[PDB]
Amino acid sequence: VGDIADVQKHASLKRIAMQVELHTSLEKKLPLWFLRKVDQKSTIVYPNKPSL
Amino acid sequence: HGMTPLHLAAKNGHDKVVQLLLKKGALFLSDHNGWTALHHASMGGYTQTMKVILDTNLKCTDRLDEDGNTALHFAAREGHAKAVALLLSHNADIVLNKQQASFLHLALHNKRKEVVLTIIRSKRWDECLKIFSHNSPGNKCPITEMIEYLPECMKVLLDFCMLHSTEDKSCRDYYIEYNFKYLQCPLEFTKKTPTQDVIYEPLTALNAMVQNNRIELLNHPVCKEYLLMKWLAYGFRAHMMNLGSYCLGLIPMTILVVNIKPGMAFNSTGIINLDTTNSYLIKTCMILVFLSSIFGYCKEAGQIFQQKRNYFMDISNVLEWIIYTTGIIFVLPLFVEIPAHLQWQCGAIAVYFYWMNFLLYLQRFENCGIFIVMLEVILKTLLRSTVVFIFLLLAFGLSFYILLNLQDPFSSPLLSIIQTFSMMLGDINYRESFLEPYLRNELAHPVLSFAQLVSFTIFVPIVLMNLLIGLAVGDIADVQKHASLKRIAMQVELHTSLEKKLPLWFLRKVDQKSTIVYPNKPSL
Amino acid sequence: LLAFGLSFYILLNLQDPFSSPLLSIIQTFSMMLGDINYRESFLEPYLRNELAHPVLSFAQLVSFTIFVPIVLMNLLIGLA
Amino acid sequence: MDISNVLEWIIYTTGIIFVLPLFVEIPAHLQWQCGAIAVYFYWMNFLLYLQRFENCGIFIVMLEVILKTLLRSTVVFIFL
Ligand SMILES: [Ca+2]
Ligand SMILES: [Ca+2]
């Protein structure tokens, strides 16, 4: 119980941290010429077409 | 800056030079930003020069700046309670600015508690209450913004609504009159009432309370009397009629199932097996299910008429859909004959799902609804752990299917997962499925199966089960952090969902706008 | 309890732990603490074809094992 | 230093000698013995691959962190 409440204190951060660290572990081994082809640097999204 | 010396005197608050210049007259010029001298005195809050400047022609009392504010805004913006008392002693007009804000809004925005306490204690309160204008994103309503910003003066306002009007405490003629004039009908405040884009939902003051979680204001007595006014007028009546419709389906099923041996088939006249005993009982509940389940169709088909494409997002609707369609083909021997094994098979679907659905209808209660929302929120997080369950269960299930193939609890791969599912709760059949096979040399892989068992006993009944307990503890403590608010929020959102579909002519008949209660006659 | 009790009263009527509707609620009450008689009340009837509704009763059992010994029991632990 | 690598190592080496009768004949009791190692460890390893998800990965890290503290209590278990 004390272990799970420690994890769920940062549960919303831990999922995004695993998302970020996945890519940074992935792009470190990826060849750089492929990166320039695959990155697009900007995006266009149509919304309605489809503490103390 | 174009300021006259009268501006410069009233800016720094010196009454006598203001009194000296008024002996010779300074004509109340407007500077850049169009401020008058009364604006500067109202800015600093020097009431002493404000008293001396309100004894002349007072043509600056209604003067406006470049943004439309008068001097009443600036005193209310900078927190000078004695200033606004001095200004409201005279006939200060209440005109919005060009951002459509009255002086009450700026005090509510800048959180001047002692100022709005002097507004509420003084006279002229109702016309500055109604002075607000609609269709503006800020400056919505002085009641609702008082909820959103300053609950404690709003509490003091509620003490003015609660008057006893009878000094004899604990008397037979002792009474308490509550007024509900500040809790509803926001269009009834404005006397002009254009109602062009007026799309106000009911119970605006209460909805703002649960959205701004001011739980100390919900337990104020006039709010409880306002809820109990709505509850006793229609709210108990409709909730009885909704449940009583469903209870008229649920009880006649349960009477029908406990009086019939569950193998047999039945006409309306009795059991085939021919019993023909208490057929007057069996005929009337078999009808009463069939009539009620047809009403459930028109209840649901009426509900998809009110909501297209929002109906399908709920899980209760497909629950309610599976409720009725078996109850028809449970009692279908009223009309056409069906085989017996079919008739009970949908029956066990029905009576299981009836009470399981009936658990949902008591969620709209004040003393038992907090367990239903707790039962749902645990069930949601367990559903998110289904892929952890399936890959753990099917791992141990297939390995036990290999290792313990000679024993009939693992003869089938499908059966082995279910037996592993029954092994989850610590009911490991250690003796008659591991040990006695091992002492009879009936284990094909003895060293593996014991090692598989010990590794099973670590993971599933200990680690996986304490994970669900640890999930449920942190989940329940999250809910019970706002348990006292969640019950009242479900009370408020019930009525606002109910009054939106209710016809307005009925509302004028049923509302009474005030009540009389005799008490002794019946953070950091 | 009376939901799972009456459904087990229909599905497992041939076995004496569910012969009476009153008895079926009590056996469901004794089934609450994880003491599911899985072998001598589900499995051995199924391998002797003594279940009238085999696909339902296993589905009723799995849905029982979710709700009462896991969700309902952890709710009481989380309340306590 | 990883424990998943020796997990992944024990994944493949039995799956070869599970299907090894593609080439050479092995005794039957050996072939299923590594098979029960394989299919148990496959899905147990497959639990780790879904850790890289957005909606179910939070249970995997919770399942690991409970398992770490239980492993630290092994000497309390063994001597008891
Ligand atoms: Ca519905
Ligand atoms: Ca690896």
Swiss-Prot record, chain B:
The modification Cysteine sulfenic acid (-SOH) is found at C153, C368. The record marks M154, T166 as: Important residue for activation by the scorpion wasabi receptor toxin. Signal peptide: none annotated. The record marks K140 as: Required for C-621 reactivity. The record marks D427 as: Crucial for calcium permeation. The lineage of its organism: Eukaryota, Metazoa, Chordata, Craniata, Vertebrata. Changing N367S: In FEPS1; 5-fold increase in inward current when stimulated by the agonist cinnamaldehyde compared to wild-type at normal neuronal resting potential; consistent with a gain of function mutation. It comes from Homo sapiens. Changing T166P: Loss of activation by the scorpion wasabi receptor toxin. Residues 414-434 dip into the membrane without crossing it. The gene is TRPA1. Ligand-activated Ca(2+)-permeable, nonselective cation channel involved in pain detection and possibly also in cold perception, oxygen concentration perception, cough, itch, and inner ear function. Has a relatively high Ca(2+) selectivity, with a preference for divalent over monovalent cations (Ca(2+) > Ba(2+) > Mg(2+) > NH4(+) > Li(+) > K(+)), the influx of cation into the cytoplasm leads to membrane depolarization. Has a central role in the pain response to endogenous inflammatory mediators, such as bradykinin and to a diverse array of irritants. The record marks C141 as: Essential for electrophile activation. Sensor for electrophilic agents. This is Transient receptor potential cation channel subfamily A member 1.
From Swiss-Prot, chain C:
It is found in: Cell membrane. Changing D35A: Abolishes zinc influx. Abolishes activation by extracellular but not by intracellular zinc. Residues 13-21, 43-53 are extracellular. The chain crosses the membrane at residues 54-80. Changing F29 to A/T: Loss of inhibition by A-967079, AP-18, and ASD. Increase in activation by cinnamaldehyde, AITC and acrolein. TRPA1 activation by electrophiles occurs though covalent modification of specific cysteine residues in the N-terminal cytoplasmic domain. Residues 22-42 dip into the membrane without crossing it. The record marks D35 as: Crucial for calcium permeation. Changing F64A: Loss of inhibition by A-967079, AP-18, and ASD. Weak or no change in activation by cinnamaldehyde, AITC and acrolein. It comes from the Eukaryota. Belongs to the transient receptor (TC 1.A.4) family. C-terminal helices from the four subunits associate to form atypical coiled coil structure; this region is probably involved in binding the inositol polyphosphates that are required for optimal channel activity (in vitro). The ANK repeat domain consists of a convex stem structure formed by five ANK repeats and 11 additional ANK repeats that form a crescent-shaped structure that surrounds the protein core. It is linked to Episodic pain syndrome, familial, 1: An autosomal dominant neurologic disorder characterized by onset in infancy of episodic debilitating upper body pain triggered by fasting, cold, and physical stress. The period of intense pain is accompanied by breathing difficulties, tachycardia, sweating, generalized pallor, peribuccal cyanosis, and stiffness of the abdominal wall. Affected individuals do not manifest altered pain sensitivity outside the episodes. Homotetramer. Interacts with TMEM100. Interacts with EGLN1. Interacts with the scorpion wasabi receptor toxin at the same site that electrophiles but in a non-covalent manner. Ligand-activated Ca(2+)-permeable, nonselective cation channel involved in pain detection and possibly also in cold perception, oxygen concentration perception, cough, itch, and inner ear function. Has a relatively high Ca(2+) selectivity, with a preference for divalent over monovalent cations (Ca(2+) > Ba(2+) > Mg(2+) > NH4(+) > Li(+) > K(+)), the influx of cation into the cytoplasm leads to membrane depolarization. Has a central role in the pain response to endogenous inflammatory mediators, such as bradykinin and to a diverse array of irritants. This is Transient receptor potential cation channel subfamily A member 1.
